[PDB]
Amino acid sequence: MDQKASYFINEKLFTEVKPVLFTDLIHHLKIGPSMAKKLMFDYYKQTTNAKYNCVVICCYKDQTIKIIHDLSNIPQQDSIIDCFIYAFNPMDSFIPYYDIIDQKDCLTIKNSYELKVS
Amino acid sequence: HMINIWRALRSDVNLTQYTIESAAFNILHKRLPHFSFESLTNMWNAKKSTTELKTVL
Amino acid sequence: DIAYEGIMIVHKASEDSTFPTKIQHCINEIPVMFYESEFEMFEALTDLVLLLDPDIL
Amino acid sequence: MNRWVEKWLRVYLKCYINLILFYRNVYPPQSFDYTTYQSFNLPQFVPINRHPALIDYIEELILDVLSKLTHVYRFSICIINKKNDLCIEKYVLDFSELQHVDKIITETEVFDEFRSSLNSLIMHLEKLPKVNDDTITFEAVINAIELELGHKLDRNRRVDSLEEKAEIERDSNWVKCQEDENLPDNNGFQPPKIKLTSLVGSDVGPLIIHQFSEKLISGDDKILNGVYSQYE
Amino acid sequence: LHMDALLTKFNEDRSLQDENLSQPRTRVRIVDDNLYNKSNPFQLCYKKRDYGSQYYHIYQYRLKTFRERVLKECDKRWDAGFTLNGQLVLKKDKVLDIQGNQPCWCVGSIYCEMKYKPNVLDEVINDTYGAPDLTKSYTGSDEIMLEDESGRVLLVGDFIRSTPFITGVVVGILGMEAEAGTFQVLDICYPTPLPQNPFPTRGKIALVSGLNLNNTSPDRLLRLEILREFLMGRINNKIDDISLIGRLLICGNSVDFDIKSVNKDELMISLTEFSKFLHNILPSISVDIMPGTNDPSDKSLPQQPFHKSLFDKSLESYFNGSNKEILNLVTNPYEFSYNGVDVLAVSGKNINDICKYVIPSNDDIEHRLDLMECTMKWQNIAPTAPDTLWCYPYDPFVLDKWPHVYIVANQPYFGTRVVEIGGKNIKIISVPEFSSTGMIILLDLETLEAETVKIDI
Amino acid sequence: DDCLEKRSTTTLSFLIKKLKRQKEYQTLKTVCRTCSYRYTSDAGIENDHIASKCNSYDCPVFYSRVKAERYLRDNQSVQREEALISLNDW
Numbered sequence A: 001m002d003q004k005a006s007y008f009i010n011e012k013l014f015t016e017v018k019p020v021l022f023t024d025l026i027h028h029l030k031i032g033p034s035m036a037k038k039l040m041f042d043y044y045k046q047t048t049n050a051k052y053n054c055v056v057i058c059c060y061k062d063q064t065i066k067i068i069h070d071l072s073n074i075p076q077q078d079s080i081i082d083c084f085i086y087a088f089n090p091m092d093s094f095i096p097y098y099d100i101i102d103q104k105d106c107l108t109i110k111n112s113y114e115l116k117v118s
Numbered sequence B: 001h002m003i004n005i006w007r008a009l010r011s012d013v014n015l016t017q018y019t020i021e022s023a024a025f026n027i028l029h030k031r032l033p034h035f036s037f038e039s040l041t042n043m044w045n046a047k048k049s050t051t052e053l054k055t056v057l
Numbered sequence C: 001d002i003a004y005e006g007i008m009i010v011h012k013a014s015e016d017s018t019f020p021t022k023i024q025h026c027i028n029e030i031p032v033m034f035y036e037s038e039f040e041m042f043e044a045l046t047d048l049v050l051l052l053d054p055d056i057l
Numbered sequence D: 001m002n003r004w005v006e007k008w009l010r011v012y013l014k015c016y017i018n019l020i021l022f023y024r025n026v027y028p029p030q031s032f033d034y035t036t037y038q039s040f041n042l043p044q045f046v047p048i049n050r051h052p053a054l055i056d057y058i059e060e061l062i063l064d065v066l067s068k069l070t071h072v073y074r075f076s077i078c079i080i081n082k083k084n085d086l087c088i089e090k091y092v093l094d095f096s097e098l099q100h101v102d103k104i105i106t107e108t109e110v111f112d113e114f115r116s117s118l119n120s121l122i123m124h125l126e127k128l129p130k131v132n133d134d135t136i137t138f139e140a141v142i143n144a145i146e147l148e149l150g151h152k153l154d155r156n157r158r159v160d161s162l163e164e165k166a167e168i169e170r171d172s173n174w175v176k177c178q179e180d181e182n183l184p185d186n187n188g189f190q191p192p193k194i195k196l197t198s199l200v201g202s203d204v205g206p207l208i209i210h211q212f213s214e215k216l217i218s219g220d221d222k223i224l225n226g227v228y229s230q231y232e
Numbered sequence E: 001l002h003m004d005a006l007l008t009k010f011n012e013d014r015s016l017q018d019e020n021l022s023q024p025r026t027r028v029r030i031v032d033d034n035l036y037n038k039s040n041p042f043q044l045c046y047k048k049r050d051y052g053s054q055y056y057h058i059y060q061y062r063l064k065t066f067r068e069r070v071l072k073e074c075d076k077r078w079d080a081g082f083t084l085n086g087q088l089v090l091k092k093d094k095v096l097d098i099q100g101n102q103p104c105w106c107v108g109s110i111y112c113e114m115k116y117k118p119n120v121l122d123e124v125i126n127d128t129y130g131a132p133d134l135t136k137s138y139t140g141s142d143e144i145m146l147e148d149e150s151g152r153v154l155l156v157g158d159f160i161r162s163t164p165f166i167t168g169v170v171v172g173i174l175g176m177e178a179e180a181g182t183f184q185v186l187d188i189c190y191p192t193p194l195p196q197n198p199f200p201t202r203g204k205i206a207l208v209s210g211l212n213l214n215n216t217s218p219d220r221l222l223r224l225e226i227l228r229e230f231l232m233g234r235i236n237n238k239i240d241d242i243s244l245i246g247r248l249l250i251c252g253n254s255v256d257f258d259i260k261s262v263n264k265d266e267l268m269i270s271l272t273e274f275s276k277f278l279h280n281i282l283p284s285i286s287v288d289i290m291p292g293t294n295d296p297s298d299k300s301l302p303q304q305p306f307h308k309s310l311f312d313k314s315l316e317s318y319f320n321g322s323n324k325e326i327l328n329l330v331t332n333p334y335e336f337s338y339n340g341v342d343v344l345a346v347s348g349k350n351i352n353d354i355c356k357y358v359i360p361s362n363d364d365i366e367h368r369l370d371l372m373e374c375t376m377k378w379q380n381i382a383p384t385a386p387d388t389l390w391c392y393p394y395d396p397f398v399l400d401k402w403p404h405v406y407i408v409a410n411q412p413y414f415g416t417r418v419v420e421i422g423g424k425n426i427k428i429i430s431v432p433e434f435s436s437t438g439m440i441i442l443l444d445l446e447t448l449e450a451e452t453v454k455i456d457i
Numbered sequence F: 001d002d003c004l005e006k007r008s009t010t011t012l013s014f015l016i017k018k019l020k021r022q023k024e025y026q027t028l029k030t031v032c033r034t035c036s037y038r039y040t041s042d043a044g045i046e047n048d049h050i051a052s053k054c055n056s057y058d059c060p061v062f063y064s065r066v067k068a069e070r071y072l073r074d075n076q077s078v079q080r081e082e083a084l085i086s087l088n089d090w
């Protein structure tokens, strides 16, 4: 959380040039998505050097997940039910990369069926 | 005046098969499906679908 | 007053009925004539050739 | 172990060259296409040009560079103004301290390092000013330690296989040059000062590659004229 | 309104509750009753294969069954002693037996033109090496005719002009004889209604189709990742409503490629991307995979399930055999008994196949929905057999039971309509693609209501 | 041996070959059906039968269709299908 999520974001943003998603914080610190959004918002502040491009999305009443691009005119302002920083981007092009995640204890909604081996 | 059309085309154009389908494709640029005689008499028999009789005609 | 195209089909009354109607519906543009036997069909062909009197066959 | 090392180096060099050509307007952006497969699995969605002649040229250049990588400690792509022969931008791939072992780093880790390096390159390239159309060209310069080129045709040997023909072509396809040959000659009236920028580099187990860029970022008139799209 | 104001209005006063993650909530249990029931009509054995023949047998079987059904329903409706306004109605067997000004009805197939679209001809001509000028071969008819193995009669009237049709559809036509050799149509008849299982806080099922992952479009991967995050409750964050989505159904077109020019490397890359998505999402929700047209499966409509291979090594536990409730691979047409609700799903090759013809007797969302309604009414799933299905050994596409929900995926538009055929209610859903108009469909099993979720960029 | 160990690559190659052959055969059948529409004037079944009954030896499409049918019914295709079943029997 404090002094740890900030260090992880700084490392993953500058030591290696990779976009940082809040799901990365979820997998790293084993914390809920709301807390991850809170930490992303906290890191968004107290930063004098704006060397990253924040990517935000708006959740509407009709469940219209929309990536904000114009950043000046957001249609249906009264219809927005949630707004958060989706990711931190060090470059103009987003193009994230995905891999295998060992979600041992990071699940917030587990399925009814359990996995059986042999 | 009797005329043999295949011989007339044989004298006129330098084809390699001089069949009705070959001549039609090479001269009139039309492709005609060719059916064997057994197929034609099978589709021409009565109590058959209207499509087969139309096809033969 | 001639059609410039035609089809002659042999169809005895002992065969399946409604075959002439089915054939006429299938064509519906080119007239079709039906004859009891092949001899009458050949006689009709002779009559047609005499009536048209073509210079080339 | 060079069976996999050469393939990874080829992929990295192809992505590097294509990114430099795309982001510096060496060729029209419409020809470039964002893709993951370019006869090899690329680390990311690198833009690769679809021109057949350009593809063959880049592949031949990469193969020629790799064939002599043992003596090559530094490979550079030079951006040259067409109006006057002068290197206005220089991107350097430092191959010094690169392990040359013929005797298990896997592919995922190597591609992660390649992704980081190429992301650093893209981040550097995006900030650079745009370049006008049909006004720039690129050049390939290698820094070798102990080799001589253009002297293997003195024996009048007849080639009998494709490998020997390719070797004789690669041995004579290069011309000796001098360091900073294309740079302005330091006129003295507000002399240009070359600008150096350091970038991240892959540090995989067998692959240790450093990368940095150079730019004039100055002039004494008649340099960088009508090439940077005015102010923006 | 500046985005900083929205960020400080929403993210600052976050709830930070009900996300302890120590005891995550269990997803709603949605069980497929046909999972171990077996007896899949659309399951075909590879050893039998296709011989490229025995299609006339299927044609004759379909004709016989549909004629029997239509005759039974006609006898039920227009029984002996039934009288029209003009006079009594008489049963006519042959189609050419209609000679008089007397009401009558007959059973027979329907004949139409059904010319191929010019783009289809241009596509098939360029890949044949010797194809003739098919446009010149086409060189038409705008009238519907009834064929009954004894002749053909012209069908005229405003009743039949307002109904879409395909050649071979066996129906029962009632009406009067016109002045010429034409039959006026006053009423139409369809096969007798099939039985329907009795209906039935349950849960919701997410329907997605047309992911079309390839090696050139990076936005599809981003949309897929956003969809996965939304389905896991990370995006919406309303864990109460998201937990209601018991199962996710992928309806086909998971990968997009050209078979003419493709290697195993690019296909493997796209398949590994899909496998990574599945591995990341399977622990939270159960996913059902359906083959598509451009998916690596057979071109005939009864597509066999995805092979156990062509998946990453991380899915070996899911492919052990015992755990088929988490990951299930099924055939392209498949009946899903989701918590007692029968769902007929097809990746849409039938509707995409009828729509490739030009029929001058009848592309819009309403047109597609009407076509699906007609497919339900005709009691077959593939009206265009020569274009849709290959040689069928020993016909599963002739319906024996009416489902509660009918799903046709990979369509240009999204639409839903509730229909009532013979007193039975069937809900028809048109699932759009995800590569274009990246929209997801949420199907509520309790009320049979479908709500839509959209993802942008 | 080595190819059998890598099940994914082998099954992908077999699937690609089979799908290419099937798509080519479907295109040929569509071409023949459109050609036979000249006589049949029909678009459904009983027109594909008539189209398949053609044996015109002056058309390259006839030779292509015969070759495609032979390839689909060849013993090598049966061998590939059996290998696919064995590979995916796990």
Ligand code: SF4
Pocket (backbone or CB within 6 Å): B031, B032, B033, B034, F031, F032, F033, F035, F036, F051, F054, F055, F056, F059, F060, F061, F062
């Ligand atoms: S083979 Fe050539 S001719 Fe015979 S049908 Fe097919 S295309 Fe027409």
